Design a protein around this ligand. Sequence first.
Ligand code: CLA
Ligand code: CLA
Ligand code: CLA
Ligand code: CLA
Ligand code: CLA
Ligand SMILES: CC1=C(/C=C/C(C)=C/C=C/C(C)=C/C=C/C=C(C)/C=C/C=C(C)/C=C/C2=C(C)CCCC2(C)C)C(C)(C)CCC1
Ligand SMILES: CC1=C(/C=C/C(C)=C/C=C/C(C)=C/C=C/C=C(C)/C=C/C=C(C)/C=C/C2=C(C)CCCC2(C)C)C(C)(C)CCC1
Ligand SMILES: CC1=C(C/C=C(\C)CCC[C@H](C)CCC[C@H](C)CCCC(C)C)C(=O)c2ccccc2C1=O
Lengths: 30, 68, 63, 97, 733, 152, 80
Amino acid sequence: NNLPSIFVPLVGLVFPAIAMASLFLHIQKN
Amino acid sequence: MFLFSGRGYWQELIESIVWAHNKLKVAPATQPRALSIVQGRAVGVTHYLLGGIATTWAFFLARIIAVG
Amino acid sequence: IGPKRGSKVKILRKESYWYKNVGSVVAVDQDPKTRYPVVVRFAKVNYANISTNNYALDEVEEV
Amino acid sequence: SPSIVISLSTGLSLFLGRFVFFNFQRENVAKQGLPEQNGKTHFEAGDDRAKEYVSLLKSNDPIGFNIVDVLAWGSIGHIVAYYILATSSNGYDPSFF
Amino acid sequence: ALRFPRFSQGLAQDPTTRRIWFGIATAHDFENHDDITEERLYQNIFASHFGQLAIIFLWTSGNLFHVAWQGNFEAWVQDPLHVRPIAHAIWDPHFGQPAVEAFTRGGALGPVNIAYSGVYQWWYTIGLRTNGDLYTGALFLLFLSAISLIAGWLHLQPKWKPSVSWFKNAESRLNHHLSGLFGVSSLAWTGHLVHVAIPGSRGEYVRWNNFLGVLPHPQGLGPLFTGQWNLYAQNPDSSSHLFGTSQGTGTAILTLLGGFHPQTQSLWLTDIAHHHLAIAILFLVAGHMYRTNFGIGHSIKDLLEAHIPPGGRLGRGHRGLYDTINNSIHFQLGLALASLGVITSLVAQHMYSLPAYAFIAQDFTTQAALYTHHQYIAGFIMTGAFAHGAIFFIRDYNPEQNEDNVLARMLDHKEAIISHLSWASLFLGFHTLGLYVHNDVMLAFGTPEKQILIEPIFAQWIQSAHGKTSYGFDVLLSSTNSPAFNAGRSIWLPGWLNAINENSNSLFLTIGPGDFLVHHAIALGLHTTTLILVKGALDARGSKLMPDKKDFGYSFPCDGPGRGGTCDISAWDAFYLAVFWMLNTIGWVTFYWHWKHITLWQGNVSQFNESSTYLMGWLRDYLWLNSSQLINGYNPFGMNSLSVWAWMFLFGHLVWATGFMFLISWRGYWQELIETLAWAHERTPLANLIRWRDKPVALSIVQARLVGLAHFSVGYIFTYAAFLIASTSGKFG
Amino acid sequence: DISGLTPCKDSKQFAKREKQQIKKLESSLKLYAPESAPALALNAQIEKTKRRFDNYGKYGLLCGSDGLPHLIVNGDQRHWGEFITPGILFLYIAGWIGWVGRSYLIAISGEKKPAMKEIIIDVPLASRIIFRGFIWPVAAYREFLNGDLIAK
Amino acid sequence: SHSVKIYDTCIGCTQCVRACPTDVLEMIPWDGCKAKQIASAPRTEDCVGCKRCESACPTDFLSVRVYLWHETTRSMGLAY
Ligand code: CLA
Ligand code: CLA
Ligand code: CLA
Ligand code: CLA
Ligand code: CLA
Ligand SMILES: CC1=C(/C=C/C(C)=C/C=C/C(C)=C/C=C/C=C(C)/C=C/C=C(C)/C=C/C2=C(C)CCCC2(C)C)C(C)(C)CCC1
Ligand SMILES: CC1=C(/C=C/C(C)=C/C=C/C(C)=C/C=C/C=C(C)/C=C/C=C(C)/C=C/C2=C(C)CCCC2(C)C)C(C)(C)CCC1
Ligand SMILES: CC1=C(C/C=C(\C)CCC[C@H](C)CCC[C@H](C)CCCC(C)C)C(=O)c2ccccc2C1=O
């Protein structure tokens, strides 16, 4: 098991960073 | 109430109030007008300061007289 | 060409502050090419501190 | 007997619809025409699904009785008959209302 | 057209940062996007509906899955009154050892949260007893969400795209919604209650693999078709019945007993099934009114046009209203929002006096949380209704087509309505404040007997008309001999009077002088909020200060300093100002409800009966007294399980104060500060290599007002939720 | 009697409250000398409290369970003096004030600049106008009948 | 750039032209008034939105109207 120890860091940290980078790049694009 | 709102709403309400007065022939010669922006800001800040200072005064005096 | 001086007229312009009120005509322009000849004075001031206005021939009704 | 009551109610409702209230219903449905949006019928506006089923309503009966009238009056009669049966089944007594 | 706001070039041309800020703000205003048509707007609305349905289904599926995976449903069902439900587990790298040891509750082996939603009782009542059922439900809901997304994608395609003439078919839509959406669903729910829930209540198990071999009634379908329906109400459950067991049960499936089940203190399931059956029958009968392709029915246009009174007291009547409603979607949104708000308020008022779930009456925190949640939602919806009504007046009103109908007459005499509303609000506020201040002064001087206490005789008389014998009157149902009493005695009053005459339940609680002032304060709040919203809606098109308000739009900052200064002149500002009054009124209502119920539960009712007639009693006996356990969540010595709530408490306060910053300070100061900061950034070494792409500017006026309002509301809600839950859960009584 | 209320002379909590108040007053009274003025003031306070309680008992109010008097605004003939008569008196006074103000406004409306008359009141005209409010209901009724009350 | 419009109720008192801080409005000859002139707003792209022209205009309602519209560097009053 131990699913929370793998899933909580993923949703908390990695996914927000990926989404922020993608949104910033899409916004700044001309 | 004086720090979150603006003059136009109060003027538009006073218009309807003045109409209701006009229907009964009690219209004053001095036409009522809403307060100016600077006047509203001054009233708001004065009331804020007075309320806060009076609250602190009452609390301090009550505590220090009842316990000391 | 317009109402005589001194007569009382009623305003029929929705835009004006004195809508459906009574004013006094002071003068009327005689040029046929003037759009708003009639000059009216009111006893009460609007939100601005003026108390005079100009109207056309189809906006003032004699009372 | 449920059969007797159901048959009586349905027959009486159909007789009332066919012979008594036919003209009134026709006049009232003629007064209020098809529903309209912006002055045009729903089919005229461009809705193909709102086309009247003219073929279905055609009938060989002399006065014009069609399937829809039969269905409506039979439904009314059945509702009345089952109300009567259900009310007569139980033994509720108002006791001086 | 080339930047981020692809739906608006004007917002995509400017180089400042507001292009970002407004880009999120106007993404759902389909009528503002350039190159827009009716077809595209309707299709986008349809797709948004499908997406919303998918999101709702996914949320419900996630809740079910988490309850199944990390809950204690199987342990809770055995002993409902001595087990605390569990919502989900807690994983936190920031937790210390004391927090881990203190947050372990129930039968769990680690930190968990206690579920105050109340879904355990709801799922237990309907017949779920195992985790496999929850897993199956979650799978089904996930499938439904996927189906909704697929349908949305399919109907966004060109081949299956509908036309505008399809979206404007009111009669067919009304018939279908009244017949299939409301009636067939109730019939199916009645079938479920008869087939699954009731046998589960009596100890039997009926599932997908054996529901065709079990007869819900020993007689069968014979009595229903033949006519003797009373055979379905022959052997009801006895008063000694124990829920979920085969001791003292019965065979009836549809009854009209009334009252509450003795053990569970909830409504009988057979009553619920009977109610749903009757409701479904009524809806199925009534869903046949309007005309369709079959040549029989009613036309709404003729129905509206035919209603004009002789004598011309109503103008032209209802002529032209059909086109006005059909062409405009804001009118429909306003009507739907008003109806939904009324329904939500009714649900909130009904679910606490007539509970329908087993063992939910003895869970006080769930009751309080549900009531507060539903009341706040209803308030927000009611505000939105008037907001969209004002939007409709601004955008979709045609003066020429609505000549001298009811709408024109409504717009004709706004002054009288506004003046009368102002008079009522002033009257109520003046007298309520005066009475409260007089009582407070009388208590302060030490002579409580000089208070002004007025009995609510009208409400007490109404209560006595229902069969309550705590006052003295014998009217209608209270009198032993009467037409109503004799007519109804044989069927439903034997249980209704017993339920209403008990003092433990919350059905028609006794009232006194303390409720009079609170009810008048509630009326004052309602009147003032209605006055604000009505003035904002009516004065939208124009006034004397600005006779061309309709040209600028629904939302705009101001009209400059001329004519004495015109701030907050738009209707958006009117909604903005009414939000505060809505929040205050809902707060008063929730305070009254919570205090009355907490005193009732604690065992002493004299505290509320005595201290609620002056405001110092409200301040001392409600907030200061009940905050003692909440503020002690963490202290220098240690902490307990309430600590998190305490944190949230403080958190809420902070947000509230932050709102004030956006609500008093205005733009010019911050613009000058931003200019100075830009100069400072440009001039410094080793940091001028990095340069921005969008010029930083201060927030706009309407944007700052919106931000302040959002902060205010968030702080309000979080603070009250934390206080209520902590205070109600610390004592559990 | 009404809504499960007890007459205030019968109720025991009323006498209990009176006893508590008298004891609280005497607790402070015991401190000062008998001849001192504070003793006289406290004795006067005690006499006033006793008289107030006696009058409240005499007037026939209905204390509740908590022992405090309650007011009935139904219109019952036994409790007309609690609400209805003061209401009539207040309505008369308010009508007097409103009629006097409206009459003064109409009287000063004739002049060229009524604003200077509003900011600086004239006393003789107001004194003449004030006493006409003693008959305000009759004048208001007659003006309503004629049609001079409502502007056109 | 905001939108500035002039209506025919103008009487040519030249207050709006003097009040403008960015030289947006000017005066042209006209025919339907005693002053024989009327205002105009050629340099619309230089408008900032201060609404001083509306502040200085004698009429029942303003004969010069300013409607806020798409913003740019000039209309935002930015010097950096
Ligand atoms: C949303 C989920 C989330 C999660 C799961 C974490 C998780 C964690 N926090 Mg962070 N944090 C968050 C949000 C979150 N935070 C937010 C919103 C804030 C603002 C208030 C902070 C502010 C914060 C502070 C102020 C501190 C932490 C620290 C910690 C660590 C505590 C464990 C420990 O005791 O140290 C165990 C020992 C460690 C130092 C871990 C070392 C290994 C780490 C995980 C690095 C792995 C490297 C990798 C390349 C990371 C970059 C990849 C990128 C995609 C993220 C852990 C990594 C503590 C910390 O990191 O110490 C400096 C700490 O002091 N957090
Ligand atoms: C009989 C068949 C039929 C059915 C079943 C529906 C059903 C539906 N249509 Mg309609 N529709 C039909 C015919 C039908 N339509 C026809 C013929 C047309 C063409 C004229 C349309 C035109 C149409 C349009 C244009 C749209 C819909 C939409 C919808 C959906 C509404 C949203 C929603 O889910 O409400 C849920 C409703 C309810 C649950 C019913 C009860 C509501 C009350 C307030 C609740 C009672 C409370 C009760 C105590 C519940 C307790 C809860 C429990 C947890 C305790 C829904 C799926 C809208 C949509 O969402 O599209 C996806 C949409 O935009 N329809
Ligand atoms: C039934 C659903 C419903 C629907 C479909 C609409 C539809 C519409 N509304 Mg209405 N409205 C509703 C209910 C609804 N409304 C309610 C209940 C209210 C009362 C609050 C309003 C009040 C309202 C106003 C005041 C306005 C509209 C307007 C609009 C239109 C613009 C949408 C938009 O721009 O938003 C996109 C907006 C956003 C994405 C940004 C704001 C998001 C808020 C601030 C989030 C709050 C933050 C969050 C909770 C923080 C969490 C933090 C955490 C710690 C908890 C759109 C057609 C606008 C209009 O001009 O119409 C022409 C308009 O000005 N509506
Ligand atoms: C708790 C403080 C507070 C109070 C008391 C009020 C009070 C009022 N609001 Mg305001 N308001 C507030 C905060 C407050 N507001 C906030 C935060 C907002 C959000 C911006 C608003 C926005 C707002 C709107 C949008 C509206 C009002 C309106 C009203 C009035 C409602 C009618 C009524 O109740 O009359 C009862 C009257 C009173 C309680 C006023 C106080 C009377 C004092 C105590 C008596 C003076 C006597 C004494 C001798 C004093 C002498 C002074 C000394 C120097 C000699 C009333 C004046 C509505 C309106 O104007 O209706 C006409 C309206 O439309 N308010
Ligand atoms: C001005 C508006 C007003 C409003 C909005 C309310 C609102 C409310 N009242 Mg209150 N009430 C008012 C004035 C008002 N009241 C007055 C003047 C009295 C007499 C003292 C009362 C006494 C009262 C009682 C005894 C009760 C309520 C209750 C309630 C609630 C239910 C409605 C009701 O029962 O109908 C009652 C409605 C009215 C009597 C209409 C009055 C409207 C006129 C215009 C008021 C002014 C009339 C004038 C003073 C009378 C003549 C004077 C007389 C001496 C000749 C509701 C919150 C009931 C409740 O639910 O309590 C929990 C209840 O038990 N009210
Ligand atoms: C051929 C012919 C004839 C005859 C005819 C007839 C005889 C007919 C009949 C008809 C009919 C006979 C019909 C019927 C119909 C029916 C219906 C349409 C029904 C309905 C129903 C319903 C709707 C129900 C419902 C319900 C349910 C289901 C459950 C419970 C409740 C209720 C009851 C509500 C003659 C000789 C004359 C002439 C020549 C030709
Ligand atoms: C702005 C606007 C709008 C909106 C509006 C709104 C939002 C409204 C609301 C409204 C409301 C919210 C209302 C309500 C009402 C209610 C009522 C009217 C009720 C009634 C009731 C009754 C009548 C009852 C009775 C009874 C009793 C008492 C008991 C039992 C028996 C019986 C049932 C008989 C619109 C869109 C239109 C458009 C235009 C503008
Ligand atoms: C409430 C409010 C008003 C309305 C406030 C008004 C009209 C002030 C009213 C003051 C007194 C109560 C008016 C009457 C004064 C006379 C001396 C009364 C003489 C009669 C007897 C009482 C003696 C504004 O005009 C305003 C303007 C700008 C921002 C905020 C606000 C604001 O919040």
